[PDB]
């Protein structure tokens, strides 16, 4: 648990890798930095070739986060609204979120 | 005659307002959110009469891929996969299983062989629906 | 008509005090410990009468996921998976296979096709129960 | 009624001097060398009478895991898996397939659907025995 | 007599203007875009008469691989896999299932056992078509 | 009664001059080049009479593993797997399917369900032979 | 009696000018380009008469592996796998299914259960042919 | 077996990686340090997408431990009670425990 | 996002690894560099041995690209026309395109 | 084969990684060094979750041993009797034994 | 494409790894060097143990090669004739050929 | 092919790794060195647990070898006769032999 503040600040470092996001949910004031990663995901179709869909996730410092790490919360990245669809612990107190686009 | 039946299907399923692409391997788009594809599939067969004729057992598979408001045309909760898929499917079923004779004739029986709703996790949620229709067509 | 039957199911299974979500791929929660989901699944089919009609063979699958005191409503040892799953299932069976006609009518036969209890190792123990009910519905 | 049948089984199989645990995922112990577990499994079904009734086809699976002197109660060579498994199994078969009516009644037929002996290589050797018993139970 | 039937097929399918290669493992070319291959496959069997005779149940599989203008001979949209495959297949079906007696005689029944269109993603798009024809041939 | 039938088998198959070990997981020796193992396997079942009785469908599997001169007892070329396996198997078949009544009685039918020869590449070549014998035994 | 039938086969298939090796695991040679191997396989069984007899359902599998001029004995294009395999196979079929009584007698029926040609990509091309012959043999 | 005491002390080192836990079972007095690791585990459902469940385990120095490495014992981590559901040897005399949450 | 211009310029570097291509679609004036990679792809046939087909792709700097990263666009590499059949994000703002030969 | 004596000696060095064992069978009259390794072993059940079983394999210098590497021999490790259930060559003249607990 | 001539010359280097071969097809005069590699390939048989067959391939510098990289051409390695059965791009302009023995 | 003599001599080096063997077949006079490797091979049984069998192979310098690299030849390692059951090229001119024990 030594990492705490330092660790969270370091990666988040804006304009290095941390893209600032704000939780449009009022539970969070004061913009937070987090790592945004999206890639291509190929989803198959039983008969079809499939469709190339895209999935974006936020990796954040959970311990740093105040408020509630909670599903169904509302957040926005770069001005696009995302409902926090899912959260899962990696056990470092650094959780990964999955954000619905809508 | 697959082309003709597929052509009937092509006319019959072009009505939803979105393009239908069948058997395009390279294509796997997400831009065309509402998605329709019709496949004539396979034909097994047996003899007809003495002196000549053939008939086939054939399956037609219709698949629909969709997201968001395409589900939400009228009634609430079509985001629920089952309601949404059913909502599109029943009308589709009526489209293909329609009263017009030409569509019915080359098809003979048009029974729904199977139905399904499937779930794939995309940002926008995408759901797959299958509507197998069994048509027995006389081999030309 | 899947939506209607699913709607009947939706009303019929909403009674346990917890939300029922069907076909939500992205969702895989542990917060909703007691869990219910109803699926209309597939419909195979055959002709009715001469001059027109269709009937379908259809399967309805009900699945329950649970932990802790949800099992322990009254009797002892519902932690045992079998007792707990059975305890929830039989009442669920009666819910869906209830006397009311509307629920029974679109469903025709409501026989239990299958039953199961399953075990997944979570801190809180989670167990899956399946209650397939076979309903034959006249195609509209 | 799985719970009741399982309860009958619970009473009927608790007699060997060791605990019986059913569906405990987290648990996989070696300390309880002699091991017993009873599963009600699945129920398929068909209609009864005109005006109402249902019956089910059901399978009950009994599994035994054992090592050392548990095999060697009396006769020599029960280390041999076959003899040892048979030795425990036949008595178990009689336990479940016993004369008492209550045990027999909810069960109707109690035929042995299957039998097996299996080998897993532990320091102490562990062997698995399965005794499927098919019971047809009227759905309540 | 596979060779003779294959020879009939060899004559019957050599007409499309492109080479037909059967069972060449090393060969997997893309230069021969329009592709044809005929396989006699397997023969199961039963007795004929008393005093001697044998007959076989046999399957002949015809496969076509194609790209671009080969699909586009006349009608529009043969790029669509289904139309294109059907367009080549029906004529092929008539080729093999032709009226000439020699072709028909060693073959006896020439029913289409199955049909298929398949999609593989190459720069030029390649699509596979299968036309199983079932021929029962008296064993010589 | 598996133990008794296995015991009959134990007596009946102990005659080849080498030890028979059944269900020993840890053991996988090459020192015992000629190898024999007998398994009672599974018992499916049905009712007998009115008022009580049960009968079972059962399979007995006999397996032989061998190398070198064990194959070469008398005739030439028993190194050939087929001849060697057959040579041991037929006599084994007669051993189990022998005339003595006790062996036959608990077994009722003693038909050879299946036969096989298998090849594993060891310095000394090892070959596996299976001789399934189907015995229907009245459940005690 | 596998050995005897295999022996008949051994005599019957030794005629092509190349050695036949059956069940040699270690051996996998390319030097013996033309390759033949005969397998007696499995025997299922049923009772004969009242008072004693047994009969078996048995399969004999013949496999041929070949390259180059072995295919090209006389007619052109035996490089084509189908023609080449058929060319060797039909004569082989006649060899085993020959008129001589001894060969026929222990075999009873000698029907071709199956046929196949297969392709493996070696510098010299190697092709596998299977000729299952079903023989029902009275158990001695 | 050279590691014994040294090895156990080093990793356990409190506030480095070892989170102190106490066995609420009276067989153990005097708080013990152990490594707590939990992550997300996806458990599937035959028809369902699945559920994201979480599993936490304690890695401890078995040799160091006095008392009994025994299942069914009671222990608490950070004030939350855990029954020791399972224990399995890694053969280093460093065993891993699995702790039920209840 | 630090890489932006620098990163795109560096790899594209003509005659190092970047083969200049021009989008014959009029939406793009001023030739663009991109990495062209093609290899052999074995496509199978259910009964057949298969066919050796070839697939070529362009790896480009998406962020650098102006205009539209869009399917159905027209582009040419080394004088051979390619329709841009597919595009998929690797999430670096460096997308990979798949170009139909026709 | 160069290593021989040296190799055997060094690994088994007592109190480094060689736990001395004595063969219960009388053919060996001298205490013998070897490497004892045991770990969790997964033995499933067709219907059941499974059982966590254990296994102990001894690794010894086969060339070092002056007496029969033979199955069915009797040996004891740390005062617990083990029948030598199985032996298999790794081809280094360093064989691994599997010892039944009984 | 920087490698071109240099790259092809370097590997081909005769008596290092490049075994000179000549295309008996008249389209090629002036002996060419290429890397010859053959190994054992086990081809199975559905019922049989299988057969050990051998496959030899030539790795060459395609760009360096003039004439035509074409199937059905005739070439000889070390005095043994090989028809060029197959060619497939690795995309480096370094293609691999498969040569039939006949 | 540069390695030839040197390479073969180096590995074979007696008492390093090369165990001298002699081909009892008269085609070979003058003892040859080769690398002998044997290990445990588990061969399964369809119903049985299996049997632990052992397979020994000789890795030799084929090019160095005169006479004939041929199957069915007779050779002996450490005084035990082995028929050379199989030979397969690794393509280095260093082939591996499999020797039947009999």
Give the termini distance of chain A in whole angstroms. 35 Å
In percent, how much strand structure appears in the residues of chain B? Answer: 25-35%
Secondary-structure-derived class of chain B: alpha+beta
Category by helix and strand content of chain A: mainly beta
Sheet with the most strands, sense and barrel status of chain A:
6 strands, antiparallel, barrel
Give the quaternary arrangement of the chains.
Answer: part of a larger assembly
Helix count of chain A, per DSSP? Answer: 1
The strand count of chain B comes to 5
**H/I helix tally of chain B:** 3
Question: How far apart are the termini of chain B?
Answer: 7 Å
The rounded Rg of chain A comes to 15 Å
Instruction: Give the overall form of chain A.
Output: globular
Largest interface: B-C, 23 and 24 residues
Helix percentage range of chain B: 25-40%
Spell out the helices and strands of chain A N to C. HEEEEEE
Protein name (chains A, H, I, J, K, L): Head-to-tail joining protein
Organism (chains A, H, I, J, K, L): Dinoroseobacter phage vB_DshS-R4C
PDB class: virus
Keywords: Marine bacteriophage, Cryo-EM, Siphophage, Stopper protein, Terminator protein, Head-to-tail interface, virus
Short description:
This is part of a larger assembly, with six copies of chain A (102 residues) and six copies of chain B (140 residues). Chain A has 102 residues and is mostly beta strands.
């Amino acid at each position: 648990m030594i990492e705490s503040l330092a660790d969270w600040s370091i990666f988040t470092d804006p304009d290095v890798f941390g893209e600032p996001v704000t939780w449009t949910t009022p539970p969070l004031p004061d913009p937070v930095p987090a790592i945004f990663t999206d890639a291509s995901e190929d989803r198959p179709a039983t008969l079809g070739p499939g469709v190339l869909t895209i999935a974006p996730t936020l990796t954040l410092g959970a311990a740093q986060l105040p408020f509630s790490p909670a599903r169904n919360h509302r957040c926005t990245v770069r001005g696009i609204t995302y409902r926090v669809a899912e959260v899962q612990p990696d056990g470092s107190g650094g959780l990964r979120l999955l954000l619905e686009r809508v | 005659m697959s082309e003709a039946i597929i052509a009937a299907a092509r006319g019959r399923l072009i009505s939803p307002p979105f393009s239908d692409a069948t058997g395009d391997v390279y294509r796997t788009p997400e831009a065309a959110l509402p998605a329709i594809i019709v496949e004539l599939d396979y034909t097994d067969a047996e003899r007809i009469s003495m002196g000549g004729g053939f008939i086939a057992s054939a399956e037609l598979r219709v698949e629909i891929l969709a997201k968001r408001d395409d589900w939400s045309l009228l009634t609430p909760t079509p985001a629920n996969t089952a309601e949404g898929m059913a909502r599109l499917a029943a009308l589709v079923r009526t489209a293909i299983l329609a009263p017009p004779s030409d569509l019915s004739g080359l098809a003979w029986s048009i029974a729904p062989a199977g139905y399904e709703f499937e779930t794939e996790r995309g940002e926008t949620p995408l759901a797959r629906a299958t509507q197998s229709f069994a048509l027995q067509i006389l081999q030309p």
